Amino acid sequence: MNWTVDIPSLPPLPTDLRTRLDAALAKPAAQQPTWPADQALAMRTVLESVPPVTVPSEIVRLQEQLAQVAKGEAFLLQGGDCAETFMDNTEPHIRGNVRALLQMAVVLTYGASMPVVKVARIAGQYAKPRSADIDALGLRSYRGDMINGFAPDAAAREHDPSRLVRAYANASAAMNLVRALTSSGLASLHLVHDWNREFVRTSPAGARYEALATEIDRGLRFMSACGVADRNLQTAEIYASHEALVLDYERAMLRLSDGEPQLFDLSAHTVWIGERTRQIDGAHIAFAQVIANPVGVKLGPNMTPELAVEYVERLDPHNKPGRLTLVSRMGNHKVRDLLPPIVEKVQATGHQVIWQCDPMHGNTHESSTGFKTRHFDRIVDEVQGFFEVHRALGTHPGGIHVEITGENVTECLGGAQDISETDLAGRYETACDPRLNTQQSLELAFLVAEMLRD
Amino acid sequence: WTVDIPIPSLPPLPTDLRTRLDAALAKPAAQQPTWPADQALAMRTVLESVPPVTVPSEIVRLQEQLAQVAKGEAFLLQGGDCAETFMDNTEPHIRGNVRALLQMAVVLTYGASMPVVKVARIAGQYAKPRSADIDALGLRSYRGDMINGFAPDAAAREHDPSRLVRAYANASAAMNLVRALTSSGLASLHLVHDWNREFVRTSPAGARYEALATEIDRGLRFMSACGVADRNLQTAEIYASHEALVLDYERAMLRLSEPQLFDLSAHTVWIGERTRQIDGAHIAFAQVIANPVGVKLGPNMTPELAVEYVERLDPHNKPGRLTLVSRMGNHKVRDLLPPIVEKVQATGHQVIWQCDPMHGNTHESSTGFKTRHFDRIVDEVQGFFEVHRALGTHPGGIHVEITGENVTECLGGAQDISETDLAGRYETACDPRLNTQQSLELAFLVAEMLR
Amino acid sequence: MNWTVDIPSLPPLPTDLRTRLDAALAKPAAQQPTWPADQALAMRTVLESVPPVTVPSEIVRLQEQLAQVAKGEAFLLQGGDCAETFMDNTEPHIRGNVRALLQMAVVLTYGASMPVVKVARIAGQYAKPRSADIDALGLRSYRGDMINGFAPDAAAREHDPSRLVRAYANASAAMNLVRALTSSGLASLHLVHDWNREFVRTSPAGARYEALATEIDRGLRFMSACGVADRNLQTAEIYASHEALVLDYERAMLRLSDGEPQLFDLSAHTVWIGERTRQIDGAHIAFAQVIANPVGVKLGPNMTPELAVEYVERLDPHNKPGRLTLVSRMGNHKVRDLLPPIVEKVQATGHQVIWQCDPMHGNTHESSTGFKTRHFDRIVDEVQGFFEVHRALGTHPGGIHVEITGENVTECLGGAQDISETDLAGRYETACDPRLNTQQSLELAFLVAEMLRD
Amino acid sequence: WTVDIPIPSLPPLPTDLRTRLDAALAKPAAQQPTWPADQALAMRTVLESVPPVTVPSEIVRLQEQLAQVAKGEAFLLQGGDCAETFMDNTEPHIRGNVRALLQMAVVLTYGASMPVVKVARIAGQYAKPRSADIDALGLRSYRGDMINGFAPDAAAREHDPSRLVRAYANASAAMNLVRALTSSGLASLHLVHDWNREFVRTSPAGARYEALATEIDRGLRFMSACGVADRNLQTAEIYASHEALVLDYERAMLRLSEPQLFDLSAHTVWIGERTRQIDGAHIAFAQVIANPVGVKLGPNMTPELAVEYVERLDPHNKPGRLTLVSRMGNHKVRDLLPPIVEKVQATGHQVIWQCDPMHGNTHESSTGFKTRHFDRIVDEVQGFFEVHRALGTHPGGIHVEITGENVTECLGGAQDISETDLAGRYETACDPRLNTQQSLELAFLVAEMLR
């Protein structure tokens, strides 16, 4: 039925880091688990002495790499499961997400004509915010495997602090795998292009994309023709990210490294802060202010230029390009109107932020059949609009942030597969928001690559 | 002071391999835990679907590098804790053990003048054999954290199948960390050598090694002066190994690649002295998997039998797939080893000859601790080298037990550690280990042996 | 008026090499200079103790590289002046030829999707065969600056053996320069693509080629995006070749190196043997049999399958792929009929030869205005036909052999510049056959690159 | 026994630079040939359009590497024939001189623990100063193959402007060859070290250097063991240099790159002891060109004047653009050098301090030959190092005269060369050179100096 853990050290914080961290977690914190302090402390004590998912050296490396995005010289690709589950944390599914993301990154690398830094939603994306604490069945809402259970049973939905330790054990495990995969041949560039050629061959819309797939093949053969040294072509770096929601988890995964000493959050390389949680004097923003990881903020349609600037000033006080990513998620019918003024006010500060586009969360809607769904064409249209805004202003479309899987699910309408509302019942397997399946995520990759080319 | 942690099914292995496997595991198995079989089946069912600790392509890469050891063109360095514990599975401890190993590997690379394959006793070394069924305090013996608890307490010593899952969790976590470390510049050659130079400053015997340390420093500077793209100098490959002993664990971590069947709890495993029953389940398991394998050869070993191991575990003549590990004792290796090497080189197979200068040189001190004398250890390595020099075969590698902690479990070395001192920091959970300073010392002496 | 040289050693040949070389030069030799033996010996003695233009190590390297062409995995680009002159042996003109050739090689590399081994007609192409010893003015025919003078003066046309030493001094000098250029930044791949982009921008037919120039730009940016190591991109190897015509020069430039000892001809990396000189028991073919350099044979429209095979057997006796290049030069109206049977008979021997195409020398004709000229469209058409033959037979179009310059001469009709017979008078500067100028050689590069793509 | 060889115009240099240049060359010039000025103009007109021996980007690359010498992070090695001859401009001789130089550079790279910039006296070193106007046989002095002939014969000694063109022809030919050699694996580090090991076998003093040779071998093996992409180990950069003396030649080889004016007969040139008249044409020429430049500083040098050279030849404070070359004598370098270094480091400019331990240590032996004692040479390098050690400045490089021929022109070394022996192979055309074995010997001793 269960395995067991014993309960025990960490070195003392510089007094200022202690004071600022304490000051930060004192502030109110939205969407937290409602569970006993007695027990959360115990779990935290376990987590305070485990090996971290990531290490500082990798996080400052990611920081430099992201600095190049902010300056206009690279492109950010963030993707993966909306909600990871302990039950799907298997080699096939991890391998599938890494695969999908890599396939997209080849196309975006060739189309942006510049590097793509590749960030997975993985090894920690186990918690989610909800708008209601009672879902559409009278049950306490599901909030991710880190908090409670998906199964629609009263007792499954109780907030269980032991999931804090499970969440880490899965996280670590998955990360161990992706490291391995990416270092050992799965991320070989020729092997991924091969899968892309397969997609063109068997997709219905193969013709739509054969020309560009071929041009990539030839720019790739060109490398061998010029006798380049192929070592950089045999691996790729995938970085872990998740939404920093459960502050009991994040605080327990903090560690102290350097160039004076600083707090890194080693549950991941980079975290972001959601629409529901970005309260400006709230605890998530203050926590972000204390950690050295690159951080993202979701910006929704109620966002105002002046506010946005307040985020930039609190999170990027030292003008470190790449430290802060602002992620727009307006919806295709609104991004062209709402985003331009925000970008004007922010670029006018002298701060170099990464303008990332989330074309997913502003475009959900309820199918006639009862499924949370997103139509492919609206997703494409929001990325289109994003690009138009940035071209018109002379600013860098920094990247994109999508929800995808390597499984061939049926959760988003449209795309080359003409997935109908009737088809959604076949393999609707998400534990929260609907995902672009393997074919739709790759097709979106091609389309955005054409936007990049212009 | 305890809290509990609750717990899909994918394809099963192909029926024909499941059949061969069932047949192989029906052989009797030594040293297995006495826990119920339904519980055990359950935990195995869990592990059968978790993400592996290693992936196959890494293992075939290791087989290639080891193939170069067997052919005489590289050298194997295998080291780490005797018995990993869950409570000492922390970032500092893993960091220090990786550190110590890398530090040895630098010196042995300069001295061997050939690559060193770096293998760590780590991520999975949670089970041990035991001779007695009742230990000195009248309790069930401690069999390793995979099986029971170290605490001298009736309940801690009960055999608990859930410790399988716990072990897996500690194994991947730790593995994850070494993967990150070796990729983020803890294995930057320049940095590791820096630590070695601090050691020459600090060590009571720093003068006996200033020469070789300086010579290494100048070969490194030499690489920089020749302007030689130092990317390969920024990272190292460290492989995971442990004694494959608990066949419930090892069998549940089997996974399928033509297609071969791999064990993805480690890159390589070995069969210990007490489990290599030629007709037992451990050797059979070693026959089925594709992982490299090692076998401990003790003083009771005969040439005739070693040949049986070659015929069994290297059927298709793959160089480096089998390592034979001498652990005789320094007063015995010179007599007992040469005949075995003779008989086995005769057969045509290319094996790795690896020296374990530790597990046959342990004695009990009047301070009450079980310990090992540094000089006896060094001397088994000296004898190992003298054997192979005499016979024209390749001295393949070492296989030592070490730590990065400044610990006090082995007598001697430059710190001249007394039996009085043993009580200071005797932190081991099983055998005594060379501490950080002693392991580096040994690396310098073995370095002189290779020149 | 003149500089002076003193007359002097070499080590003795293995007796078998001596015997075979003696046996070879005893055979009759066509198109030789008619000048005193007394003096030719003297010049030879000077040349027997000079530093060579090339060294053996480079020639066996070229041999391996050409082996890859024969096996179908690379492509051969040979080009340069028809006839070098001592008077045009200046840094600007050498730099111009290297430049032109490099520009072509970028395009052909990208279009073949495989390496291009780059061979210049340079540092030795100072002698030529003639069909008549009296030209159209009653003067002894001009035979290249190695033999006599271009100037139409009786005394200029006397065969002067001192030109053997001049020829070397210029050769060495030019080679010194190209080495330098190619090693020091002229052959940087980005710097050459830049010139190509300039061509597209200012050419009249820019539109014809903008798409492919852009695709090359993007496959080139792709390399940096993937973080390749750029050292191989900063230089390129250019090899010297010329027609081995004056056997007094070639024999004096022989040296003995290794893997038993062999005779290398170090006046160049590779030599070829012309239509006028390929007599099968003649001295040129026998000389080729003795040297270790890769060798080419010109094959004209009177060529027969069986003969061709005799060349292959004499020149490639050890079946060393890449050792022998057969160079077709039929003319566009004839290549499709004459070449296929030859290729059938030769491939049927088990020998792997490089099928190189010379679309120049079969397409000369006399303008209405009196200029030796070649029409661009016929040149293109012969390369087209060459490719068609090889596709139809499943054999490798190995390369091409053109006559080009970096100067903006007017010597070939047609191309994007619509160069008319009236325009030929402007800058007709060749010392023998008409050359594709810079723009026409690059346009031809694009067209052949499209044939390679198919 | 002679045969004769007969002989476009492109843009001229920009008028404003032609103006500055004419103004600079109107200064008086020492040691120039006494040949007619119309003939000379003609030959210059020829050279003004020929292909250069070097190209500018190579020169600015050299300026970068030398900038690293001046800053203390690299070391300069300059060596080759004293006086190149047309008749010894052969593949074997160039091959042997490049060989000898590379062989020294390997040892000095291991010993310096920093890159060595490798500069050869080659492709252009065809003119020499002379003290006497009438030599010992009562003939016009031999001024170098660029000017007249070595043969003791009234006619050979006439100053012949066509030897300009001849020299150019020999300079590019030779240059071509070194370019090919260094690019085709005569500069493959593994091969060059091989020759060094043959030397330790062969040399009468092979035992004094077996230690350092072995240590180098093991650092090389070390690079291979760390698996370090050895492309940069397959080739070397060798630069051409000569004493810029015949201003007709050097001026005709000027060529225009913002745009700078370069001298493309060599990568770098120097002004000798007899031509550095501060207000003369040689220093002026050095002011105008962008090439690196060196100046010989003799025993009559004063600190005050050296400063004038710095102010003149390094106006825009470019580190490494100017090298100052000490040639005092071993009994003099310790006294005479320190004040100069003092005065010049004072000025703020970063120069290269280079030791010429040869041109101030030459004496006539009773066998009649002019020669140099090996120990005196070594000792001027020792004193040079001791000076710079004392003052905290960087000992920048050496500047020796050597050959790859097994020649007998300098006394001493491991072969203990007697004055009896000098007559054996005294093949030089001017100063006596260290032979192949002696130059390598010197490299090992200087290597010990750098440690």
Ligand SMILES: N[C@@H](Cc1c[nH]c2ccccc12)C(=O)O
């Ligand atoms: N290492 C480079 C190139 C590369 C290797 N594998 C890849 C897979 C996908 C995209 C790019 C790559 C990068 O990550 O950009």
Ligand SMILES: N[C@@H](Cc1c[nH]c2ccccc12)C(=O)O
């Ligand atoms: N190219 C490097 C290393 C090197 C290659 N070949 C060499 C020969 C000698 C000395 C050094 C080298 C250098 O010039 O330093």
Ligand SMILES: N[C@@H](Cc1c[nH]c2ccccc12)C(=O)O
């Ligand atoms: N060195 C490679 C790539 C290259 C460098 N410079 C070039 C110039 C033109 C064409 C290719 C190249 C080659 O020669 O193929």
Ligand SMILES: N[C@@H](Cc1c[nH]c2ccccc12)C(=O)O
């Ligand atoms: N990567 C090489 C060299 C190397 C890098 N870091 C190291 C640390 C220790 C020893 C060797 C290395 C190896 O594993 O051999």
Ligand SMILES: N[C@@H](Cc1ccc(O)cc1)C(=O)O
């Ligand atoms: N985990 C601690 C913070 C901490 C981090 C690192 C330390 O070294 C010490 C303390 C907390 O949440 O309060």
Ligand SMILES: N[C@@H](Cc1ccc(O)cc1)C(=O)O
């Ligand atoms: N040059 C000589 C041939 C030769 C070549 C190399 C030698 O080493 C000797 C002789 C000839 O033409 O007859």
Ligand SMILES: N[C@@H](Cc1ccccc1)C(=O)O
């Ligand atoms: N994912 C399964 C098995 C597992 C256990 C521990 C770590 C990783 C995976 C679970 O959480 O129960």
Ligand SMILES: N[C@@H](Cc1ccccc1)C(=O)O
């Ligand atoms: N090492 C501790 C904490 C831990 C829990 C789970 C996985 C990894 C580590 C234990 O085993 O109890």
Ligand SMILES: N[C@@H](Cc1ccccc1)C(=O)O
């Ligand atoms: N090309 C000129 C000048 C020159 C001389 C010698 C070598 C190279 C070029 C000539 O032949 O007269």
Ligand SMILES: N[C@@H](Cc1ccccc1)C(=O)O
């Ligand atoms: N070195 C010989 C031959 C030679 C001629 C021309 C150029 C180069 C070399 C000479 O100067 O006479």
Ligand SMILES: [Cl-]
């Ligand atoms: Cl604290």
Ligand SMILES: [Cl-]
């Ligand atoms: Cl006990």
Ligand SMILES: [Cl-]
């Ligand atoms: Cl001969």
Ligand SMILES: [Cl-]
């Ligand atoms: Cl004299």
Ligand SMILES: [Mn+2]
């Ligand atoms: Mn979501």
Ligand SMILES: [Mn+2]
């Ligand atoms: Mn043990």
